[PDB]
Design an enzyme around this catalytic site. Structure first.
Site, PDB file in Angstrom:
ATOM      1  N   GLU A  59     -43.220  19.562 -26.709  1.00  0.00           N
ATOM      2  CA  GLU A  59     -42.181  20.260 -26.001  1.00  0.00           C
ATOM      3  C   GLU A  59     -42.851  21.199 -25.001  1.00  0.00           C
ATOM      4  OE1 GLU A  59     -38.942  20.155 -25.788  1.00  0.00           O
ATOM      5  OE2 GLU A  59     -38.360  18.831 -27.487  1.00  0.00           O
ATOM      6  N   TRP A  71     -28.883   8.863 -33.006  1.00  0.00           N
ATOM      7  CA  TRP A  71     -30.142   8.156 -32.747  1.00  0.00           C
ATOM      8  C   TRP A  71     -30.283   6.836 -33.509  1.00  0.00           C
ATOM      9  CZ3 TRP A  71     -34.678  12.192 -32.297  1.00  0.00           C
ATOM     10  CH2 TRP A  71     -34.351  13.104 -31.309  1.00  0.00           C
ATOM     11  N   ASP A 115     -36.999  18.478 -19.445  1.00  0.00           N
ATOM     12  CA  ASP A 115     -35.979  19.495 -19.499  1.00  0.00           C
ATOM     13  C   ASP A 115     -36.400  20.775 -18.736  1.00  0.00           C
ATOM     14  OD1 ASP A 115     -35.011  17.647 -21.429  1.00  0.00           O
ATOM     15  OD2 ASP A 115     -35.198  19.097 -23.103  1.00  0.00           O
ATOM     16  N   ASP A 141     -37.047   8.297 -23.893  1.00  0.00           N
ATOM     17  CA  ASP A 141     -37.287   9.720 -24.165  1.00  0.00           C
ATOM     18  C   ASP A 141     -38.305   9.918 -25.285  1.00  0.00           C
ATOM     19  OD1 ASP A 141     -36.855  12.501 -23.892  1.00  0.00           O
ATOM     20  OD2 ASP A 141     -34.983  12.452 -25.065  1.00  0.00           O
ATOM     21  N   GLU A 179     -43.629  12.961 -27.974  1.00  0.00           N
ATOM     22  CA  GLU A 179     -44.439  14.186 -28.116  1.00  0.00           C
ATOM     23  C   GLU A 179     -44.483  14.762 -29.523  1.00  0.00           C
ATOM     24  OE1 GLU A 179     -41.492  14.398 -24.641  1.00  0.00           O
ATOM     25  OE2 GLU A 179     -41.273  14.349 -26.837  1.00  0.00           O
TER      26      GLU A 179
HETATM   27  O1  LIG Z   1     -29.414  15.786 -27.491  1.00  0.00           O
HETATM   28  S1  LIG Z   1     -30.342  14.732 -27.697  1.00  0.00           S
HETATM   29  O2  LIG Z   1     -31.741  15.155 -28.197  1.00  0.00           O
HETATM   30  O3  LIG Z   1     -29.844  13.711 -28.562  1.00  0.00           O
HETATM   31  C1  LIG Z   1     -30.674  13.958 -26.139  1.00  0.00           C
HETATM   32  C2  LIG Z   1     -31.530  14.706 -25.116  1.00  0.00           C
HETATM   33  C3  LIG Z   1     -32.991  14.531 -25.500  1.00  0.00           C
HETATM   34  N1  LIG Z   1     -34.014  15.032 -24.593  1.00  0.00           N
HETATM   35  C4  LIG Z   1     -33.724  14.677 -23.161  1.00  0.00           C
HETATM   36  C5  LIG Z   1     -32.293  14.983 -22.706  1.00  0.00           C
HETATM   37  O4  LIG Z   1     -32.132  14.596 -21.335  1.00  0.00           O
HETATM   38  C6  LIG Z   1     -31.276  14.314 -23.642  1.00  0.00           C
HETATM   39  O5  LIG Z   1     -29.921  14.645 -23.259  1.00  0.00           O
HETATM   40  K   LIG Z   2     -38.759  23.113 -20.095  1.00  0.00           K
END
Ligand SMILES: O=S(=O)(O)C[C@H]1CNC[C@@H](O)[C@@H]1O
Ligand SMILES: [K+]
Length: 660
Positions: free
Chosen positions: A132, A283, A452, A385, A388
């Site tokens: 992160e 998920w 993010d 996605d 990490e």
């Molecule tokens: O809310 S969630 O973890 O399920 C999805 C996010 C994960 N990390 C990248 C973001 O753009 C997603 O919305």
């Molecule tokens: K950030």
């Protein structure tokens, strides 16, 4: 390289350029031993080493063997091989190595993967460990403080989803360390750079050339280039909605404002797992009939309108989903020290980690999920996605320590995506995008996104950090970068403004891909369809992007042919202008356009350095500006500070943008 003896020891050079210098009094290498702590909490790492030994390798014998002093047992062998220095540990107890590279006082160094805070890394230290990246990333801001207190989640300037132990020096060489271990680039000393590695790397590789462009070309050939962008991308923006069936009604309103749309990206195609903390996703990587009961039909209807559909996948499986028991029965999860499935805490739910070191598990994910559930279902792309969160106490089927697999993970994950895509003959047509990376991600992933950002204009987690991420990742051979329009993270009362969305959209029109995102808390944050001024501004910028497509296509073709990124630092094309070397909030969009995004609230003007000895044309006014000086232009909303070279072959195109 050229090895050379001296009075007291040796030097290693690339052509005219001394890289390593060794004598007993000024040694190049130090070897030792540490005991690290690396505690993971929701993908944040609290890392601290305890160094037990760090001992200079003062004695060199000539292939070169290195010992602590004369008459002691050699600990390291160095073998020169083409452009590489190969290293072999002769003392098996070494788990710390430090290497000094000769530096000049005014030298700049760039790269390090995707750096979010600092582009020129000189003067600071950069640990290289995927995690992160942090919320706020600046211990002086309240957001960062609040994130640290609540979840160890503030991070700092060096954290990134995509580190890489590679640098480009202003001395016209690049250096790459071949390791997946934890490493650090320490640029705090004037006379040398120091590399710390928690392993003895197999090799260190060097690239040189007479231009920075040539070196970036050579690096991109080494890591692998991306396909050209697919044709369909150029139709407009990818609209990000996570509102179930209501997404389609909102898309229609967006389209009725004249917005040019290439794709609908619905990360909630798998279901939303709404919580008191955020609108998370379910998920389990298959279309969710409860959330999108006619999704297959809708994808076909959108296709008939010239709009693609994109989804969302990551390499973990939630414990309460139906794919989890399948993967567990087949033995496809990483395991704990007792041989049971290792569960990782993602906050509101736990998941298994699909073990890509098991070839059967990697093949299964590519065939069953990427292939059947995504591509065969009708997806033209997706957010790919994570990558990490591998903890260092997990066990992998290849028997390799998780301390070494952690940084390898994003590349293994990229490869699973790429294999699935290739299995359907869609390489260069399917568009997946990753936020995580490491060495080698370049060969598999066709598009990076900046991960993010906070929903703000902050220095260390806002709009401006995207530019730094694009510039740094570009020099490392990732030719295409983009960001979430309007940022992602809304916490602690930090929510979007109209202005933020508009400024972010302005930048995004002059990048490979325009893509929106409702974020972590959609109902608390303004979205592009919810304010008429924002939506009209968005539609206009999408028309600008579509009008620019022929130029962006030419840049994609250049990227495939020469490896140069689409977003380039000023120094790449203006090497003789020192003032271009540290600039990280402007970029050259190809050789022929200069973009200087506004990255603070309340600004009506933008000041920047215009490079060169010709003339630049301001895109919106057609007024000319002489290169080689600082300038200030008016930047009302809709008119970002963008310029094109007067002598550009694409001038007729650029002239038209003024009219739209
Ligand atoms: O809310 S969630 O973890 O399920 C999805 C996010 C994960 N990390 C990248 C973001 O753009 C997603 O919305
Ligand atoms: K950030």
């Amino acid at each position: 390289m050229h090895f050379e003896t001296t009075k007291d020891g040796f030097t290693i050079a690339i052509g005219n350029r001394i890289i390593l210098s060794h004598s007993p009094d000024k040694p190049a290498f130090f070897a030792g031993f540490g005991e690290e702590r690396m505690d993971m909490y929701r993908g944040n790492f609290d890392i601290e080493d305890y160094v037990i030994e760090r001992t200079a390798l003062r004695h060199a014998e000539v292939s070169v063997t290195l010992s602590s002093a004369p008459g002691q047992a050699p600990r390291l062998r160095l073998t020169l091989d083409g452009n590489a220095i190969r290293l072999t540990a002769l003392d098996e107890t070494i788990n710390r190595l430090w290497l000094r590279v000769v530096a000049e006082t005014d030298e700049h160094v760039w790269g390090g993967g995707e750096q979010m805070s600092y582009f020129d890394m000189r003067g600071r230290r950069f640990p290289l460990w995927t995690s992160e990246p942090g919320v706020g990333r600046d211990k002086t801001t309240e957001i960062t403080f609040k994130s640290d207190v609540s979840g160890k989640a503030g991070g700092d300037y060096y954290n990134t989803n995509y580190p890489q132990p590679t640098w480009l020096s202003s001395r016209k060489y690049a250096l790459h360390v071949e390791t997946s271990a934890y490493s650090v680039f320490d640029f705090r000393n004037g006379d040398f750079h120091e590399i710390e590695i928690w392993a003895v790397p197999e090799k260190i590789e060097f690239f040189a050339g007479d231009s920075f462009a040539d070196i970036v070309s050579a690096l991109s050939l080494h890591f692998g280039r991306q396909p050209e962008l697919p044709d369909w991308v150029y139709n407009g923006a990818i609209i990000g909605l996570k509102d179930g069936v209501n997404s389609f009604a909102r898309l229609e309103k967006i389209r009725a404002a004249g917005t040019k749309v290439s794709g609908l990206w619905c990360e909630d195609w798998v279901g939303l797992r709404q919580t008191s903390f955020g609108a998370r996703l379910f998920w389990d990587w298959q279309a969710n009939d409860t959330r999108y009961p006619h999704l297959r039909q809708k994808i076909a209807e959108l296709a008939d309108q010239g709009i693609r559909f994109l989804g969302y996948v990551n390499p973990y499986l939630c414990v309460d989903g139906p794919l989890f028991p399948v993967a567990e029965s087949a033995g496809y999860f990483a395991t704990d020290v007792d041989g049971k499935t290792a569960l990782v805490d993602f906050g509101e739910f736990d998941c298994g980690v699909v073990d890509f070191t098991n070839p059967a598990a990697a093949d299964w994910f590519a065939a069953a999920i990427i292939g059947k559930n995504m591509l065969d279902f009708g997806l033209s792309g997706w957010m790919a996605d994570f990558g990490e969160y591998l903890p260092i106490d997990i066990k992998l089927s290849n028997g390799v320590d998780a301390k070494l697999m952690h940084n390898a993970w994003p590349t293994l994950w990229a490869e699973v995506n790429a294999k699935g895509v290739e299995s359907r003959g869609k390489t260069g047509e399917a568009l997946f995008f990753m936020r995580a990376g490491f060495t080698g991600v370049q060969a598999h992933c066709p598009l990076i996104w900046g991960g993010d950002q906070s929903v703000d204009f902050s220095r260390h987690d806002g709009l401006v950090t995207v530019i730094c991420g694009a510039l740094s990742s570009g020099l490392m051979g990732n030719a295409y970068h983009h960001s979430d329009i309007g940022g992602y993270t809304s916490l602690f009362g930090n929510v979007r403004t109209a202005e933020l969305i508009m400024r972010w959209t302005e930048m995004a029109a002059f990048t490979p891909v325009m893509r929106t995102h409702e974020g972590n808390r959609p109902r608390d944050n303004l979205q592009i369809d919810q304010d008429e001024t924002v939506l009209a501004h968005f539609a206009r910028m999408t028309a600008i992007y579509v009008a620019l497509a022929p130029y962006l296509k030419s840049l994609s073709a250049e990227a495939a042919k020469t490896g140069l990124p689409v977003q380039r630092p000023l120094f790449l094309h203006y090497e003789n202008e020192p003032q271009t070397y540290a600039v990280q909030d402007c970029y050259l969009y190809g050789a022929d356009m200069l973009v200087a995004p506004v990255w603070k609230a309340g600004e009506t003007q933008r000041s920047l350095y215009l490079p060169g000895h010709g003339e630049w044309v301001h895109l919106w006014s057609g007024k000319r500006h002489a290169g080689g000086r600082d300038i200030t232009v008016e930047t009302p909303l809709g008119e970002p500070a963008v310029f094109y070279r007067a002598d550009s072959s694409h001038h007729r195109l650029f002239e038209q943008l003024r009219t739209i």
